[PDB]
Amino acid sequence: KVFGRCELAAAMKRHGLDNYRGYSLGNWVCAAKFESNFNTQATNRNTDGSTDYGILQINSRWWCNDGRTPGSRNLCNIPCSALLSSDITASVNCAKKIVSDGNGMNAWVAWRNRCKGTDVQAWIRGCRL
Ligand SMILES: [O-][Cl+3]([O-])([O-])[O-]
Ligand SMILES: [O-][Cl+3]([O-])([O-])[O-]
Ligand SMILES: [O-][Cl+3]([O-])([O-])[O-]
Numbered sequence: 723k724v725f726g727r728c729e730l731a732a733a734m735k736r737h738g739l740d741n742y743r744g745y746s747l748g749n750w751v752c753a754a755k756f757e758s759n760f761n762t763q764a765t766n767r768n769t770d771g772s773t774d775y776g777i778l779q780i781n782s783r784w785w786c787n788d789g790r791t792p793g794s795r796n797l798c799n800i801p802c803s804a805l806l807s808s809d810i811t812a813s814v815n816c817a818k819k820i821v822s823d824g825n826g827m828n829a830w831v832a833w834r835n836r837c838k839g840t841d842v843q844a845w846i847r848g849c850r851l
């Protein structure tokens with residue numbers, strides 16, 4: 723599914739990401755914009771041969787199993803394909819683990835490079851949250 727900006731913000735909130743580990747909703751929307759363009763079916767092969775999956779481009783090296791990423795852990799305990807569903811529950815649950823891992827949202831290099839420090843609230847403006 724390709725989510726609308728406000729639609730994804732509502733979903734992410736319903737799933738308890740607003741201010742999760744201190745990161746307001748707009749940081750989540752922003753990272754998903756730049757990670758998947760809001761597309762639950764986004765897959766991207768990384769240089770190490772792992773793949774990123776979903777709305778928040780969770781990577782098979784540490785977080786989910788895709789069966790083709792040597793050395794990988796499946797820390798969120800799920801098939802990576804479960805991160806491409808139209809229902810973001812599994813992606814959100816897994817994101818909560820990733821952002822809790824130590825580096826907060828810097829885990830998403832696109833968040834660090836394109837969202838961090840910016841007016842992320844712009845990402846949920848006009849939304850009936
Ligand atoms: O639809 Cl945006 O790419 O302006 O969230
Ligand atoms: O990817 Cl780790 O669990 O070392 O942070
Ligand atoms: O859209 Cl930024 O990549 O300026 O947050």
Ligand SMILES: [O-][Cl+3]([O-])([O-])[O-]
Pocket residue numbers: 745746747748749750842843844845846
């Ligand atoms: O993450 Cl915010 O509610 O500043 O957009």
Ligand SMILES: [O-][Cl+3]([O-])([O-])[O-]
Pocket residue numbers: 851
């Ligand atoms: O906390 Cl609200 O459902 O009243 O906007």
Ligand SMILES: [Cl-]
Pocket residue numbers: 791792793794
């Ligand atoms: Cl392996």
Ligand code: NI
Pocket residue numbers: 850851
């Ligand atoms: Ni409200």
